[PDB]
Amino acid sequence: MGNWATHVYVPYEAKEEFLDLLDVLLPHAQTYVPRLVRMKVFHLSLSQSVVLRHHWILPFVQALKARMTSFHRFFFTANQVKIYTNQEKTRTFIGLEVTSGHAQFLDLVSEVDRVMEEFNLTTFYQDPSFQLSLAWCVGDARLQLEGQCLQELQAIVDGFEDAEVLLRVHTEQVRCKSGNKFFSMPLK
Ligand SMILES: [Cl-]
């Protein structure tokens, strides 16, 4: 059956305005670190990447559905640019950290963590932050991206006028990736 990489997140339903903004942010960042790559899809993590035995994928998804189904949609703000790495410092990310709405993400995490525990999986990061990743690169490029680049990225974001794109984002769904499979579920 195998063990399958499993991750729970909140998709971000990117539309043209956001993608066009990223068309400016990413080349800006690439003047500092050319090898940055745009994310293909956008989401905010609610869990670590864990592994689940194949037999438990559908039960895990159904456990999530049962919990997530009662959780209402909500609004968040993600307009604070951040540079971060993975734990091993072998990948660097540019993302947008959630400010308003963080508390609602924490409530989602509390439910996901319960499902994780129900299946013996690791619960969420001990220092929770939520962020919408925009781009990544191999290696540790924090020093190149933090400082002037970050400030300039933030100023691009701060100059962006349509509040619905980053300032008042209305969540819609939670999704669970397991291997190559993606299981969606609505928020109320
Ligand atoms: Cl590079």
- Domain of 95, CATH number, reads 3.90.1140.10
Resolution (A): 1.2
63 Cα to the center of ligand 1, angstroms: 42
185 contact partners, CB below 8 Å, separation of at least 6: 61, 64, 65, 68, 69, 173, 174, 175, 176
45 Cα to the center of ligand 1, angstroms: 26
Instruction: Tell me which method was used to determine the 3D structure.
Output: X-ray
* 173, 7 Cβ separation under 8 angstroms: no
E strand spans, the chain: 3-11, 37-38, 43-45, 50-53, 75-76, 78-85, 91-98, 131-138, 169-170, 173-178, 181-186
Sign of CA dihedral 110, 112, 115, 119: negative
169 Cα to the center of ligand 1, angstroms: 32
Measured distance between the N- and C-terminal CA atoms of the chain, rounded to whole angstroms:
34
Structural domains in the chain (count): 1
Question: What phi, psi does 171 have (nearest 5°)?
Answer: -70, 155
- Reading the block at residue 101, the tokens are 């709405």
List the domain range (segments joined by +) for residue 101: 1-188
Q: Which residue in this structure is represented by tokens 């781009």?
A: 135
141 Cα to the center of ligand 1, angstroms: 9
29 Cα to the center of ligand 1, angstroms: 10
138 Cα to the center of ligand 1, angstroms: 9
- Give the separation between CA 139 and CA 134, rounded to whole angstroms: 16
